[PDB]
Amino acid sequence: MDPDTNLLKNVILEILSIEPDLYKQSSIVDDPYKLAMSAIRLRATIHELNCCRDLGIIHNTKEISLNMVIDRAIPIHPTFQHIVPDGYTIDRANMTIIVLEASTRSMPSDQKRKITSDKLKYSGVEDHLKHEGWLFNIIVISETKPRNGNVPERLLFELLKLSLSILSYSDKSSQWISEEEYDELKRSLTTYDFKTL
Amino acid sequence: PMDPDTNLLKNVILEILSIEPDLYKQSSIVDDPYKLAMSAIRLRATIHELNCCRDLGIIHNTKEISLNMVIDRAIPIHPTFQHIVPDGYTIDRANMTIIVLEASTRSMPSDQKRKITSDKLKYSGVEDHLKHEGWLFNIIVISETKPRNGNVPERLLFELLKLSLSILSYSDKSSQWISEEEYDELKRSLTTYDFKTLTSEFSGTK
Amino acid sequence: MDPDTNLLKNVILEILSIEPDLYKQSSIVDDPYKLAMSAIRLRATIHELNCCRDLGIIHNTKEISLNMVIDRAIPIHPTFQHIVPDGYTIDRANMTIIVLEASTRSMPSDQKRKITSDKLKYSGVEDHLKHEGWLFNIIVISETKPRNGNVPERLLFELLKLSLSILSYSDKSSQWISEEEYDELKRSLTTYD
Amino acid sequence: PMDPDTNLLKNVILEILSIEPDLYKQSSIVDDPYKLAMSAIRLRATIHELNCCRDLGIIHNTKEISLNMVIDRAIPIHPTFQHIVPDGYTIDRANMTIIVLEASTRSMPSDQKRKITSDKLKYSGVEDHLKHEGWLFNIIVISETKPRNGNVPERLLFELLKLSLSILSYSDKSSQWISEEEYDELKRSLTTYDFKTLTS
């Protein structure tokens, strides 16, 4: 297992030199399992960050809630359901609030189910902001691969490959990762579109 | 200048994770003061979640499976629900019952009420669907003034809060790491501890 | 010194996440020498715990003596030599007592000498218990490496490697560890495969 | 609930280690009441050993070398002995004499006699073997009602005992940390504590 964590550590460190904002969530620990899980979260966080850049919105790394987003646009409003969006912006000029939900899923049928589950969180919110005089655009993205942006795809591939390598090697991985998440990542690796890499 | 507080907070976190090692997989110990402060704040919340789960006899959801995945483990065929990640859950197939837990700390009772309302509102419609299938779906929502400490000494929960706030209060550059609301909530939480705890020297383990 | 001790602290936490009962003897202090000595004791304790698991007996972390063990089985008995076994069990239904002495030594010749010294502690005890119709089974284990059980060997190696690195760093170590134990640990590390 | 006891016991141990810094290597200060209570109880026994060794002019065996190792240092060749770790030792090479010390505390004289017997019995055969190799072997065995406190005020030793027992008496979670037999021995020492030496 020794070569895999050492390379994964260097992969993570190289990604941070390209996108230093990811330092807030990264880890370079020696524990191979903890390092693998942080690489998996980093993969998802890279996708979010690049979706936020492409949309010109704030990456919600401080994890403020939908209620707190709306607070910065309309101080008085009913208490909505608890939601933490991946990204948001408040356009005071245009009286518009944008929220983003971004994910990766290897198969199109899972992307559609993920998109649905994410959209369902927001029931009723647009109606309330409709009445209270604001535009509320919910953007929901679920794509086959994480958007790499400035990060070479080679590095995102190695996040996936090395983490699964670490996690497949042993029994005790099941304390760290659900069968669902492991299966989704393994499918993304086995069906990886290598044409781009 | 932040080094003494940062070195002490590392020792607090190390001691807590020695006492309750189930938390190790959800935590982290780094030398960066702001990153360490945020890990301490997350650990405070995770300790609360853990002990609420223990007190209720349910699973602490550290793998962060969603509501849809919980229901998959009870009823293979079901419509897609909203995306929710509960703090804890259990599936009692004997009693055809699912329990989900939402746990939080909020220092002021009016904030506790709004938090409880926001958390329970995530689950709109779910109970009806499960009762339609003959199942019980019990949503337990707890919001308390202080974190439940369980086996962790309360002084260490306190030090997570005081040392992280001391680090974050040195320069408002920490605003990039923590929101105004969370920072203010933690400041309010600090004022609910007694004067002796707030002012006494703490030296950690030796 | 801080790279080694920072790593050693996280090695200790990882081990505790797998075997939480080792918290009774663990340390995560900042003093590198105290931390290294604690990691050396943890190494031996892991071996004890896993030997106890393999034998199905109680790891004696409360350090009850042989006289105390026999008091629990046979209330009236002559005073025996003071011994604290690494593990024990009392099977009252079958009138059987088991005690364990577990250790590591790098050289097979030193394993045999260690086994002999641990066995010799118990002279006369089995004869007294057998005279009352009890069995008294003394299990003595001295192996090249700690039994790691559920703990990855990686972590047991790091306990040894990082502790010795800290301790070889200065003759400050002389206040913390005897030449005999340091030499034996250095043997275990230099011959570690 | 255990917080006042824990806070005070932490400071008691800190004060003791200020007085006898050598104890720092052997002791621990933590914030967990149970682990701190066991540290305090172990420290109480270690203070007794330290002062017995000092009072007799012998080495406190803090690195826990075995009897075989002690004899290895004095005599090149010898049979493997039983494993023993004395509380203290001294090798007087010029007078070809080895001294070992076993020190303990027990509340009752009858238990002191039994403990003395159990410690002496560890050493069966050793004196005779060493006589054959030209060496004198003296075994000193001490079991007293209170720990010898030396530089440490007895009030601090009393607090080690009282506060650790207060913590451990609270609940059954203590059964993970201490045997019933050791708890009873310590509680006996507290209930029959002779306060006349605390007055003086």
Residue numbers in the entry:
A (entry chain D): 1 to 197
B (entry chain B): 0 to 205
C (entry chain C): 1 to 193
D (entry chain A): 0 to 199
List sentences from the manuscript:
Therefore, we expressed and purified the first 205 residues of the CASV L protein as N-terminally His-tagged protein. As expected from the metal-dependent enzymatic mechanism of viral endonucleases, thermal stability assays showed a concentration dependent stabilization of the protein by manganese ions with an increase in melting temperature of up to ~10°C at a concentration of 10 mM manganese (protein concentration in the assay 4.2 μM). After His-tag cleavage, the protein was crystallized and the crystals diffracted to a resolution of 1.9 Å. The native protein crystallized in space group P212121 with four molecules per asymmetric unit. The structures of the four molecules are very similar with the only difference in the C-terminal 15 residues, which are not visible in all molecules (RMSD between 0.227 and 0.317 Å). The CASV endonuclease has basically the same fold as endonucleases from LASV, Pichinde virus (PICV), and lymphocytic choriomeningitis virus (LCMV) even though the amino acid sequence of this protein is hardly conserved among these viruses (identity ranging between 20 and 55% and similarity ranging between 54 and 79%). Slight differences between the structures were observed in the long α-helix parallel to the β-sheet (α-helix shown in orange), which is separated into two helices in CASV endonuclease domain compared to the other structures, as well as in the helical region shown in green, which is composed of four to six helices of different length and orientation. The highly conserved residues of the endonuclease active site are positioned as in other arenavirus endonuclease structures. We also tested for endonuclease activity using our previously established RNA cleavage assay, however, we did not observe enzymatic activity of the isolated domain.
